[PDB]
Amino acid sequence: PPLAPGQVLRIGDLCEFVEFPSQLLQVCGDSFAAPVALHVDTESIDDPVRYTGVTGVGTPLLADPTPPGDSQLPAGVVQINRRNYLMVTTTKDLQPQNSRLVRAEAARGGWQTVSGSRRNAAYQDGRQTQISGYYDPVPTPDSPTGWVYIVADSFTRGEPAVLYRATPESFTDRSRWQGWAGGPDGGWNKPPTPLWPDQLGEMSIRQIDGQTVLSYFNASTGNMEVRVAHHPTSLGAAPVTTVVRHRLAQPYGGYISPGSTIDELRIFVSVIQFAVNPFKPW
């Protein structure tokens, strides 16, 4: 239906959504003390959602087992064409111990860790234990193949968000991510600067109608918010649409449906679905 700018309405432990052509997976973890992937009935993601299966109960969902006393939790998704990468952050007493990349598969489990992708929790000033990313194939001087833009922050929600970019070719090598720095002395491939001072949490970023759309949990405000910008490097200057306020008690999540429109995003929070026509910089 027709929604007004900024108008949001409700349609009807830690989980993350991975979208494969034939299956939507809800990868959920414990946070205490395995990580499983629930097959979501796509027909039910509108009917005020049912599941048709689960991966990771019999055989494990991840190839690397969980160290005793630790917990492996999903912490962001990057989709490059049809390659799906999930960040898995292992915590101990809820303190992040390390983060790694994992190649997600739809039909089976035993998801393999991306070779060489493990980093301790202190990596990059502790602002790369939670991420979201999207691929823009538009060529630029530095890349004929485009860029995977990646927003990152701390799994613990105590740090602001920063922006990296990687060529689709080189994304799997974390050491090749180029941080974005604002300011006269800034630019790409520099120690990244906070997009803005608020302490952020979980993020979902996607290009809709050529627009960078970021749905995130703002921990400073404690609300599920949305930002729309023309380029990710301007997300800090983007207008904010509050989606879930505190409306619902202690929100968390904010997954942008692939079938979202620039004037009608469908955002899942926890799962409840919200339709929001966000404020746009024009």
Rounded-to-integer distance, Cα 178 and Cα 191, Å: 8
Scan for tokens 């160290």, then name that residue.
67
Residue burial 198-216, b: 16+ Cβ < 10 Å; e: rest: bbbbbbbbbebeebbbbbb
Rounded-to-integer distance, Cα 69 and Cα 80, Å: 33
Rounded-to-integer distance, Cα 83 and Cα 64, Å: 20
Copy the structure tokens of residue 160.
């602001």
Asked whether 183 and 192 are in contact (CB, 8 A), the reply is: no
Pick the closest to residue 269 from 245, 247, 244 (CA basis).
244
User: Angle CA(176)–CA(177)–CA(182) in degrees, nearest 5?
Assistant: 135
Rounded-to-integer distance, Cα 193 and Cα 165, Å: 13
CA distance from start to end of the chain: 22
Rounded-to-integer distance, Cα 272 and Cα 216, Å: 15
At residue 174, φ and ψ (nearest 5 deg) are: -60, -30
The amino acid at residue 184 is P
Rounded-to-integer distance, Cα 175 and Cα 116, Å: 9
- Residues with Cβ within 8 Å of 262's Cβ and at least 6 positions away in sequence, in order, are 208, 209, 211, 213, 228, 280
Beta bridge partners of 206: 213
Any idea where the domains of the chain sit in the sequence? Answer: 8-12+67-276
At residue 44, φ and ψ (nearest 5 deg) are: -95, -5
Rounded-to-integer distance, Cα 231 and Cα 243, Å: 21
Rounded-to-integer distance, Cα 229 and Cα 249, Å: 28
Copy the structure tokens of residue 277.
């026509």
Secondary structure of the chain in HEC code, one letter for each residue: CCCCCCCEEECCCEEEEEEECCEEEEEEECCCCCCEEEEECHHHCCCCCCEEEEECCCCCCECCCCCCCEEEEEEEEEEECCEEEEEEEEEECCEEEEEEEEECCCCCCCECECCCCCEECCHHHHCCCEEEEEEECCCECCECCCEEEEEEECCCCCECCEEEEECCCCCCCHHHCEEEECCCCCEECCCCCCCCCCCEEEEEEEEECCEEEEEEEECCCCEEEEEEECCHHHHHHCCEEEEECCCCCCCCEEEECCCCECCEEEEEECCEEEEECCCCCC
188 CA to centre of own chain: 21
Expressed in Å, this structure's resolution amounts to 2.4
CA-derived radius of gyration, the chain:
18
Method of determination is X-ray
- Residues with Cβ within 8 Å of 233's Cβ and at least 6 positions away in sequence, in order, are 163, 180, 182
